[PDB]
Amino acid sequence: MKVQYCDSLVIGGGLAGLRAAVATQQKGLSTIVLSLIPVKRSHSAAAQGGMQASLGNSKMSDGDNEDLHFMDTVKGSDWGCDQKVARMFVNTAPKAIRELAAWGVPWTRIHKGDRMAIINAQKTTITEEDFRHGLIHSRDFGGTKKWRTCYTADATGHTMLFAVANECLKLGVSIQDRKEAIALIHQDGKCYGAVVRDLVTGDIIAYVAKGTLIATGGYGRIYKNTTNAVVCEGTGTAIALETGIAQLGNMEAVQFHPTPLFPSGILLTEGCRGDGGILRDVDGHRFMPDYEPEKKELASRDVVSRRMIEHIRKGKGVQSPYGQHLWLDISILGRKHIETNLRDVQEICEYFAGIDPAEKWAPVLPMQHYSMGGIRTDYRGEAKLKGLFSAGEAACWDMHGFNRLGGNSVSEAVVAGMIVGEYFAEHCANTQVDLETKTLEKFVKGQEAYMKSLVESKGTEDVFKIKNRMKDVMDDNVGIFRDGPHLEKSVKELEELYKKSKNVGIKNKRLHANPELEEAYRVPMMLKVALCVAKGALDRTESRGAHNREDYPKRDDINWLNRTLASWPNPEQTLPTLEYEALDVNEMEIAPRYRGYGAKGNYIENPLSVKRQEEIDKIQSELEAAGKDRHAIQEALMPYELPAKYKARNERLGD
Amino acid sequence: MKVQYCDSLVIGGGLAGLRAAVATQQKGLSTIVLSLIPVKRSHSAAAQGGMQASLGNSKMSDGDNEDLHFMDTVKGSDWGCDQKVARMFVNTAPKAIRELAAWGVPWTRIHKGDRMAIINAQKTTITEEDFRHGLIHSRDFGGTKKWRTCYTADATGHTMLFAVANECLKLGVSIQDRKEAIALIHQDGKCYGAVVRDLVTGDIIAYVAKGTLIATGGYGRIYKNTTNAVVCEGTGTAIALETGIAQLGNMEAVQFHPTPLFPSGILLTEGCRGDGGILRDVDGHRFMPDYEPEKKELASRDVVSRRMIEHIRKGKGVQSPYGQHLWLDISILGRKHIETNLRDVQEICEYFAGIDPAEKWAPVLPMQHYSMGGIRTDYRGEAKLKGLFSAGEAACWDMHGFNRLGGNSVSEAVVAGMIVGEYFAEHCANTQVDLETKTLEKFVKGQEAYMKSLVESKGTEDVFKIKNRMKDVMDDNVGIFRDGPHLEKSVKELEELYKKSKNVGIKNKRLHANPELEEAYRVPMMLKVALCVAKGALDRTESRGAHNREDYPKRDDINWLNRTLASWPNPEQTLPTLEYEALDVNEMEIAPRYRGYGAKGNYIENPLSVKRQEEIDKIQSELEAAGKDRHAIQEALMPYELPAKYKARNERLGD
Ligand SMILES: *Cc1cc2c(cc1C)nc1c(=O)[nH]c(=O)nc-1n2C[C@H](O)[C@H](O)[C@H](O)COP(=O)(O)OP(=O)(O)OC[C@H]1O[C@@H](n2cnc3c(N)ncnc32)[C@H](O)[C@@H]1O
Ligand SMILES: *Cc1cc2c(cc1C)nc1c(=O)[nH]c(=O)nc-1n2C[C@H](O)[C@H](O)[C@H](O)COP(=O)(O)OP(=O)(O)OC[C@H]1O[C@@H](n2cnc3c(N)ncnc32)[C@H](O)[C@@H]1O
Ligand SMILES: O=C(O)/C=C/C(=O)O
Ligand SMILES: O=C(O)/C=C/C(=O)O
Ligand SMILES: [Ca+2]
Ligand SMILES: [Ca+2]
Incomplete structure (x- = not known):
C-alpha cells in the first residue's frame, strides 16, 4: 500500500486552500496541498470584479467601516447567514487586503485629482485629496452605497492567486497537482485523511493527516450554463457528503450572473468599469426601464436577472441554435479619455464572440455563477466530521446566506483561509490521531x-x-x-x-x-x-x-428562518436526507427586515423579529447615551470570536 | 513532523537485508531499505572465502548432503545452536546458491580433468569426471571433510551482494542510504518502526511500517583489532536493546580469525586457496608443529588462534610499535602452474603491508572477525518485541551457537534473508497496526x-x-x-x-x-x-x-547447556540484565558429545545427553531396519518447520 503523511492536508489549490496552507506551514506543520490542476489555474484566477474590504481610502469610500460592510452583507444574505461569521469576516477583510499588499499584489492606487462619470446621476466629478494619494483604491461594485471593492486593474483574482501560491512555494508547502481526492478516510466520527487518485499514473494513494481541509470551490458545472471553470464540479462537496456524516448547507442557494456571454458563459464585465451597457430585446428595445423605471439597468443584479427571464418568457427574446438570449449593447460608448487603464472587454468579444463591442451587440443570458451552499461548518470552519475543515466557496461557513454580495466571495476565500487556517493549525497541533x-x-x-x-x-x-x-x-x-x-x-x-x-x-x-x-x-x-x-x-x-x-x-421568516442541512447516511439511499438548523433571532445583531432590493413588504414577519428589534433599538440608544462607542455597542448586541492573531482593530485614514 | 510509511521496513543493506527486501517487495508489499552507506559497500562485499552449501557437484563434494552439513554445523557450534534452525539452514543453502546462479552470480565452474595438490598428505591428484563439467565448483574451506564452499573466484561476497542489490533495483525496492536508525518506535510490546536520522541533512524522521527487520551486521568494531569494516559498530543491536524488551543472545560468543594482517586487520586469505602458508615466531621458528604435531598449520582455525596466543605469552612474539604479533610466511610457494585464476594476496601485502609475499613475511595476529551473538529471535526471525524481525550476523537466530562454521555466515545472510523474508512478508501482510x-x-x-x-x-x-x-x-x-x-x-x-x-x-x-x-x-x-x-x-x-x-x-553441559539473554529494562541501569534460555536435549537431533576439534574429553557430561543419545541410536536402528530413508529418520528424530516456498528437496548429481 502507498501512504503519504503530513500534519495538515489541504484539498484544493485555490485562494482558500493556498492561504490555509500558508497558515499551517508557517508554524512548522508539514502540509500538502492537493489539486486537480496546477494551483495557479484555479477558478479564483478568473476574478475581475474585485475584492470587498472596508478600507475607507478613496473619496467614495470615505467613512466606510466594519459596521457598514456588515450591514450590506447581512441584508444581502436576506437574513440567511450566520451574523457572527459575517462579523469575523468584515473585521478581517481589511487586513487580508493589506497582507496581500505586503506580499506584492499590485493593487491599483489612488492619485490626486479629479475624475468624471461613474455615477447614476446628479454628481459626476470625484476629487481625491492629496492625503489619499498612493493608497489602495476602490471601485463601484456589488451595489454597495460605499465603494469598497479593491482591484489590481482587470486581473484581481489572478494577481491574488499568484501571490498566495508564491508564498506557499517560499515556505516549502508541498504542492501536488494532477492528484484527485475521491474519498475521505474516517472512523468513529473522525476524519483521518483522503484516498487520492493520481490522475497521471492511476495509483490510488492514502494521504493521512491530523487534520484535513476541503477548499475545492463551487459546483456550478452541474448546470449546463455557468461562468465556472470546467473543473468546478463539486466532487469535494461529494466526498464530504459520501462520508454519511458531514453535512451540506443550503445547497439550493445558487447565485446567477445577469450578463455572461451566450452561450459560452465567458464573463463580459461590461457595464462594470463604466456604466453604459444597455440591455436590449429581440426588437432592439431597451426593456429595463419598463420594469425598473428608477434604477433601470443599474438595479440590483439580482433584479436584473429576474427581469431578463421575465422579458424572455414574454416572448421578446432572441432565438438561436443554443436557446434564447438577449442583447448587451456597449457600443453606446466605444470611447472616452485616458489617465488610467480601461481596455479589455473588446478582446473577449473579438476572441470568442468574434466581434467588436463598439459595433455589434453581445448575446447574453443569466447563468449559474456562485455557490453559496457547501460543506456545513461551525464558525471555526470545522464540519460535523471531526478533523474535517472547509473554507472558501466549497464551504457554507455561512456569511452569505441566500445571496452573496458582489466582491465578497474572493474576499471570503482569503479571509476564511486566514481565520479557518488558524483554527485548522490549532487543531492539527493539538489533536492526536489513531491511524489504523x-x-x-x-x-x-x-x-x-x-x-x-x-x-x-x-x-x-x-x-x-x-x-x-x-x-x-x-x-x-x-x-x-x-x-x-x-x-x-x-x-x-x-x-x-x-x-x-x-x-x-x-x-x-x-x-x-x-x-x-x-x-x-x-x-x-x-x-x-x-x-x-x-x-x-x-x-x-x-x-x-x-x-x-x-x-x-x-420570504417566510416564521417557518423558514433556517438553514437546509443535507446528508447521505445510507450509502444505498437514492435521495438526500434533509434536516433544518433554525436561526436564533436573539443571536442576531440585525433583526430580519427589508433586504434592500426587490419588492417591498414581501416577507412573512416573525413575531420574534419585532421583539428582538425593539431590544436592539433599546440596548443601542442607552449605551449610546452613556457615550459608548460602536465597538462597545456591537459587543453588547452580538459578541463574536476571532483567533488571537486577528482581533486587532483596523486603522483607517483619519482615526 | 516528517513521517515515511511502508509496509515492510528493512534496516540494513547487506546480503540479509537486501534479500529480505526482495522477498517482501516481490509480493507487492511496499518496502524501504535503510542503510548508513550505499548498499553495495556493505561488509558482505569483503567475503573472499566462499559460501557453504551441500551441492555435491565436484569430486571432493561427492556424497555431500543436508545431513553431513548439518552435523558439521552442530558440532562446530559446540552444541550451542538451535538444531532445528540449523536444519532449516542446511536444507535451504543449496537453493540459495542456485537462485543466485540464476541471478547471474558468476560462480566458478568445474571442468573435466585432473588437478594437483590442495591436500594435507597421501593423495595429491583430483579427477573431475565429464558429467560434473559445467556445474558449480567448490573448494576446501572451513575445515569440513566434504568440500562444499562455493565461490566466484576471489570476490564471492562482492558478486553475491551486487546481484541481490541489483534485484532490489529491478523490483523497485526503495533504497535510502546515508540514513541511520537511531531508535525503534514501540508500544504495548509491538514495534511500529524506527526513528531515523538523515546523515546528510540532519533531519529526524519517523519510518513507520507494519513490520520492521534489523539486518545491521556485526559489532566487531567494539574491539580495537578486527577484520570488520569501519561501520560494523553494533548500533542496530543497540537500538534493539534500548527498547527494554527485545533481547540479545550470546553476545559473549565472538569469533576470531587467526591470520589477519597486523595491525590493519586486512584479511590475508593466505594458506587458503593453496595450503603452504607457514606461521613463524620471533626466531623464524615454525611453531605450529610443536603444539599440533599431526595437524600442524592445518589444524582447526579455532586451535591455531589459541596456539598463536600461547606462543606469544611464552615470550616468542615479535615486538612492534603497535603490539606483539607473529609471522606468516608464504614465500615457501611464490609460484606454480596455471589453468585457472590464482593471484591476489600479493597485492594486499604490497598495497598495505608494502611488501612482496614471495619475499618477506607478513605480520599477523588473531583478531575479532564474526559475531555469533545478536538480536534473539524465534525460528521465524521474530524478536520478543512483536513485529521486529532480524536476520544475518545482527541476529542470534542461532544456527551458530558458540562457533560459526567457516563459510556458513555469508550463507546464513542469504538463507535467512529468504526464510525470515517469507515469515516477515507473511507478518506484514496479515498484521494490522494502530499508528498513534x-x-x-x-x-x-x-x-x-x-x-x-x-x-x-x-x-x-x-x-x-x-x-x-x-x-x-x-x-x-x-x-x-x-x-x-x-x-x-x-x-x-x-x-x-x-x-x-x-x-x-x-x-x-x-x-x-x-x-x-x-x-x-x-x-x-x-x-x-x-x-x-x-x-x-x-x-x-x-x-x-x-x-x-x-x-x-x-564445557559444562550440566549448568551451561543454555543461551545467554541480555536486556536493558530500566533505561537508567548501567549494567545489562542477564537471563538464560535452557537448551532442551530432547529437542536435539544430535546429543552433546565431542565437538571434533580441540582437546578430547574436555566437557562435563550431562546425564540427559546419554539418555537422549541412546533414544536416538534406538530410533534410528529400528526405522533403518524397516528400510526407511534418511528423510524419514530425520523427521522422526527432530521435525522442523520451513515456509511452503522452500520445503522441497534438493536435487543432486546422481539421485
Ligand atoms: C467563476 C467566477 C467567479 C468569480 C468571478 C469571476 C468568475 C468568472 N469574479 C469574482 C469577483 O470579481 N469578486 C468576487 O468576490 N468573487 C468572484 N468570483 C467568485 C470567486 O472567484 C470564488 O468564489 C473564489 O475564487 C473561490 O476560491 P476557492 O479557493 O474556494 O476555490 P477555487 O479557486 O475554485 O479553487 C478550487 C480548487 O479545488 C481543486 N479541487 C476541486 N475538486 C478537487 C478534488 N476532488 N480533488 C483535489 N483538488 C480538487 C481545484 O483544482 C482548485 O485548485
Ligand atoms: C568482515 C569479514 C567477514 C566475512 C569474510 C571476510 C571479512 C573481511 N569472509 C567470509 C567468507 O568467506 N564466508 C562467510 O561465510 N562469511 C564471511 N564473512 C562474514 C560475513 O561476510 C558476514 O557475516 C555477512 O556478510 C553479514 O551480512 P549482513 O547482511 O548481516 O550484514 P552486512 O553485510 O554487514 O551489512 C550490514 C548493513 O547494515 C547497515 N547498518 C548497520 N547499522 C545500521 C544503522 N544503525 N542504521 C541503518 N543501517 C545500518 C550497514 O550500512 C549495512 O548495509
Ligand atoms: O461581474 C463580474 O465580473 C464578477 C462578479 C463576481 O464578483 O462574482
Ligand atoms: O579466511 C577468510 O578469508 C574468510 C573467513 C570467513 O568465512 O569468515
Ligand atoms: Ca459555498
Ligand atoms: Ca549474530
Missing part, C-alpha cells in the same frame, strides 16, 4: 476495487449523455425561477439519472491518464450534489435571496 | 531533543578517546583467552566508560553532516553492546566454542 492500517487498507482497496469495476463494467449507459442530461435538467428546472411541479420532476429525473450512472460502460480500459474513467466516477458524485440542490429547492417552500419559488413568492 | 501520532511524536521529539542536548553539552569528555579506551579494554580482556579477574575489571571500566560518555562535548555544533555528532550518540550505544559481551563473558563460567575461560577450561 486496517481502516486505511479498507478505504484504499475499496477505491481500487471501485476503479476496477468501472473499467470492467459491461454497462451500456454513456457517461457523457448522462452528464449532459443532468446539466439540462438543472438549467431548465433549478434556475432563477422555480416552482414545485417542475422541481418535483427534476428531482425524479435526477434520481433516475443517478441510477443509470451506475450502469455506465467505457471504451478505454487503462487505469492511467484516462479522461473517460475520470467522468465515470465524477458524474455519479455530481448527481448526488445535484440531488441535494434540487430536493433542497423543492422542500424549501418560500422565496429567499436567490431562491425564488413562484408558488411561494414570499 | 502521540507515540510517533514522542519518539521523534525525544530524539530531536537528544541531538540538541549533545550539541549543547558543555561536557569535557572526548568521545574519541572514550571510544578508543573501550576498544583496548575489549581487546585486552575479552579476547581468545578470558578469566574472571580480568573480565571483572573490564566490566567495571566499561561501566565507568559508559557514564563518562554521557559527559561528552563536541566542537562542531551543526546538526547536518556532522561526523563528530555521529560519534557522540553511537559510542554510548557501542558501550552498552560491549557491556553485554563483557558481562556475558564474566557470568558464563565454562569454556564453549570460541568462549574460553582459563579458570573454567571445560
Whole structure:
C-alpha cells in the first residue's frame, strides 16, 4: 500500500486552500496541498470584479467601516447567514487586503485629482485629496452605497492567486497537482485523511493527516450554463457528503450572473468599469426601464436577472441554435479619455464572440455563477466530521446566506483561509490521531476495487449523455425561477439519472491518464450534489435571496428562518436526507427586515423579529447615551470570536 | 513532523537485508531499505572465502548432503545452536546458491580433468569426471571433510551482494542510504518502526511500517583489532536493546580469525586457496608443529588462534610499535602452474603491508572477525518485541551457537534473508497496526531533543578517546583467552566508560553532516553492546566454542547447556540484565558429545545427553531396519518447520 503523511492536508489549490496552507506551514506543520490542476489555474484566477474590504481610502469610500460592510452583507444574505461569521469576516477583510499588499499584489492606487462619470446621476466629478494619494483604491461594485471593492486593474483574482501560491512555494508547502481526492478516510466520527487518485499514473494513494481541509470551490458545472471553470464540479462537496456524516448547507442557494456571454458563459464585465451597457430585446428595445423605471439597468443584479427571464418568457427574446438570449449593447460608448487603464472587454468579444463591442451587440443570458451552499461548518470552519475543515466557496461557513454580495466571495476565500487556517493549525497541533492500517487498507482497496469495476463494467449507459442530461435538467428546472411541479420532476429525473450512472460502460480500459474513467466516477458524485440542490429547492417552500419559488413568492421568516442541512447516511439511499438548523433571532445583531432590493413588504414577519428589534433599538440608544462607542455597542448586541492573531482593530485614514 | 510509511521496513543493506527486501517487495508489499552507506559497500562485499552449501557437484563434494552439513554445523557450534534452525539452514543453502546462479552470480565452474595438490598428505591428484563439467565448483574451506564452499573466484561476497542489490533495483525496492536508525518506535510490546536520522541533512524522521527487520551486521568494531569494516559498530543491536524488551543472545560468543594482517586487520586469505602458508615466531621458528604435531598449520582455525596466543605469552612474539604479533610466511610457494585464476594476496601485502609475499613475511595476529551473538529471535526471525524481525550476523537466530562454521555466515545472510523474508512478508501482510501520532511524536521529539542536548553539552569528555579506551579494554580482556579477574575489571571500566560518555562535548555544533555528532550518540550505544559481551563473558563460567575461560577450561553441559539473554529494562541501569534460555536435549537431533576439534574429553557430561543419545541410536536402528530413508529418520528424530516456498528437496548429481 502507498501512504503519504503530513500534519495538515489541504484539498484544493485555490485562494482558500493556498492561504490555509500558508497558515499551517508557517508554524512548522508539514502540509500538502492537493489539486486537480496546477494551483495557479484555479477558478479564483478568473476574478475581475474585485475584492470587498472596508478600507475607507478613496473619496467614495470615505467613512466606510466594519459596521457598514456588515450591514450590506447581512441584508444581502436576506437574513440567511450566520451574523457572527459575517462579523469575523468584515473585521478581517481589511487586513487580508493589506497582507496581500505586503506580499506584492499590485493593487491599483489612488492619485490626486479629479475624475468624471461613474455615477447614476446628479454628481459626476470625484476629487481625491492629496492625503489619499498612493493608497489602495476602490471601485463601484456589488451595489454597495460605499465603494469598497479593491482591484489590481482587470486581473484581481489572478494577481491574488499568484501571490498566495508564491508564498506557499517560499515556505516549502508541498504542492501536488494532477492528484484527485475521491474519498475521505474516517472512523468513529473522525476524519483521518483522503484516498487520492493520481490522475497521471492511476495509483490510488492514502494521504493521512491530523487534520484535513476541503477548499475545492463551487459546483456550478452541474448546470449546463455557468461562468465556472470546467473543473468546478463539486466532487469535494461529494466526498464530504459520501462520508454519511458531514453535512451540506443550503445547497439550493445558487447565485446567477445577469450578463455572461451566450452561450459560452465567458464573463463580459461590461457595464462594470463604466456604466453604459444597455440591455436590449429581440426588437432592439431597451426593456429595463419598463420594469425598473428608477434604477433601470443599474438595479440590483439580482433584479436584473429576474427581469431578463421575465422579458424572455414574454416572448421578446432572441432565438438561436443554443436557446434564447438577449442583447448587451456597449457600443453606446466605444470611447472616452485616458489617465488610467480601461481596455479589455473588446478582446473577449473579438476572441470568442468574434466581434467588436463598439459595433455589434453581445448575446447574453443569466447563468449559474456562485455557490453559496457547501460543506456545513461551525464558525471555526470545522464540519460535523471531526478533523474535517472547509473554507472558501466549497464551504457554507455561512456569511452569505441566500445571496452573496458582489466582491465578497474572493474576499471570503482569503479571509476564511486566514481565520479557518488558524483554527485548522490549532487543531492539527493539538489533536492526536489513531491511524489504523486496517481502516486505511479498507478505504484504499475499496477505491481500487471501485476503479476496477468501472473499467470492467459491461454497462451500456454513456457517461457523457448522462452528464449532459443532468446539466439540462438543472438549467431548465433549478434556475432563477422555480416552482414545485417542475422541481418535483427534476428531482425524479435526477434520481433516475443517478441510477443509470451506475450502469455506465467505457471504451478505454487503462487505469492511467484516462479522461473517460475520470467522468465515470465524477458524474455519479455530481448527481448526488445535484440531488441535494434540487430536493433542497423543492422542500424549501418560500422565496429567499436567490431562491425564488413562484408558488411561494414570499420570504417566510416564521417557518423558514433556517438553514437546509443535507446528508447521505445510507450509502444505498437514492435521495438526500434533509434536516433544518433554525436561526436564533436573539443571536442576531440585525433583526430580519427589508433586504434592500426587490419588492417591498414581501416577507412573512416573525413575531420574534419585532421583539428582538425593539431590544436592539433599546440596548443601542442607552449605551449610546452613556457615550459608548460602536465597538462597545456591537459587543453588547452580538459578541463574536476571532483567533488571537486577528482581533486587532483596523486603522483607517483619519482615526 | 516528517513521517515515511511502508509496509515492510528493512534496516540494513547487506546480503540479509537486501534479500529480505526482495522477498517482501516481490509480493507487492511496499518496502524501504535503510542503510548508513550505499548498499553495495556493505561488509558482505569483503567475503573472499566462499559460501557453504551441500551441492555435491565436484569430486571432493561427492556424497555431500543436508545431513553431513548439518552435523558439521552442530558440532562446530559446540552444541550451542538451535538444531532445528540449523536444519532449516542446511536444507535451504543449496537453493540459495542456485537462485543466485540464476541471478547471474558468476560462480566458478568445474571442468573435466585432473588437478594437483590442495591436500594435507597421501593423495595429491583430483579427477573431475565429464558429467560434473559445467556445474558449480567448490573448494576446501572451513575445515569440513566434504568440500562444499562455493565461490566466484576471489570476490564471492562482492558478486553475491551486487546481484541481490541489483534485484532490489529491478523490483523497485526503495533504497535510502546515508540514513541511520537511531531508535525503534514501540508500544504495548509491538514495534511500529524506527526513528531515523538523515546523515546528510540532519533531519529526524519517523519510518513507520507494519513490520520492521534489523539486518545491521556485526559489532566487531567494539574491539580495537578486527577484520570488520569501519561501520560494523553494533548500533542496530543497540537500538534493539534500548527498547527494554527485545533481547540479545550470546553476545559473549565472538569469533576470531587467526591470520589477519597486523595491525590493519586486512584479511590475508593466505594458506587458503593453496595450503603452504607457514606461521613463524620471533626466531623464524615454525611453531605450529610443536603444539599440533599431526595437524600442524592445518589444524582447526579455532586451535591455531589459541596456539598463536600461547606462543606469544611464552615470550616468542615479535615486538612492534603497535603490539606483539607473529609471522606468516608464504614465500615457501611464490609460484606454480596455471589453468585457472590464482593471484591476489600479493597485492594486499604490497598495497598495505608494502611488501612482496614471495619475499618477506607478513605480520599477523588473531583478531575479532564474526559475531555469533545478536538480536534473539524465534525460528521465524521474530524478536520478543512483536513485529521486529532480524536476520544475518545482527541476529542470534542461532544456527551458530558458540562457533560459526567457516563459510556458513555469508550463507546464513542469504538463507535467512529468504526464510525470515517469507515469515516477515507473511507478518506484514496479515498484521494490522494502530499508528498513534502521540507515540510517533514522542519518539521523534525525544530524539530531536537528544541531538540538541549533545550539541549543547558543555561536557569535557572526548568521545574519541572514550571510544578508543573501550576498544583496548575489549581487546585486552575479552579476547581468545578470558578469566574472571580480568573480565571483572573490564566490566567495571566499561561501566565507568559508559557514564563518562554521557559527559561528552563536541566542537562542531551543526546538526547536518556532522561526523563528530555521529560519534557522540553511537559510542554510548557501542558501550552498552560491549557491556553485554563483557558481562556475558564474566557470568558464563565454562569454556564453549570460541568462549574460553582459563579458570573454567571445560564445557559444562550440566549448568551451561543454555543461551545467554541480555536486556536493558530500566533505561537508567548501567549494567545489562542477564537471563538464560535452557537448551532442551530432547529437542536435539544430535546429543552433546565431542565437538571434533580441540582437546578430547574436555566437557562435563550431562546425564540427559546419554539418555537422549541412546533414544536416538534406538530410533534410528529400528526405522533403518524397516528400510526407511534418511528423510524419514530425520523427521522422526527432530521435525522442523520451513515456509511452503522452500520445503522441497534438493536435487543432486546422481539421485
Ligand atoms: C467563476 C467566477 C467567479 C468569480 C468571478 C469571476 C468568475 C468568472 N469574479 C469574482 C469577483 O470579481 N469578486 C468576487 O468576490 N468573487 C468572484 N468570483 C467568485 C470567486 O472567484 C470564488 O468564489 C473564489 O475564487 C473561490 O476560491 P476557492 O479557493 O474556494 O476555490 P477555487 O479557486 O475554485 O479553487 C478550487 C480548487 O479545488 C481543486 N479541487 C476541486 N475538486 C478537487 C478534488 N476532488 N480533488 C483535489 N483538488 C480538487 C481545484 O483544482 C482548485 O485548485
Ligand atoms: C568482515 C569479514 C567477514 C566475512 C569474510 C571476510 C571479512 C573481511 N569472509 C567470509 C567468507 O568467506 N564466508 C562467510 O561465510 N562469511 C564471511 N564473512 C562474514 C560475513 O561476510 C558476514 O557475516 C555477512 O556478510 C553479514 O551480512 P549482513 O547482511 O548481516 O550484514 P552486512 O553485510 O554487514 O551489512 C550490514 C548493513 O547494515 C547497515 N547498518 C548497520 N547499522 C545500521 C544503522 N544503525 N542504521 C541503518 N543501517 C545500518 C550497514 O550500512 C549495512 O548495509
Ligand atoms: O461581474 C463580474 O465580473 C464578477 C462578479 C463576481 O464578483 O462574482
Ligand atoms: O579466511 C577468510 O578469508 C574468510 C573467513 C570467513 O568465512 O569468515
Ligand atoms: Ca459555498
Ligand atoms: Ca549474530
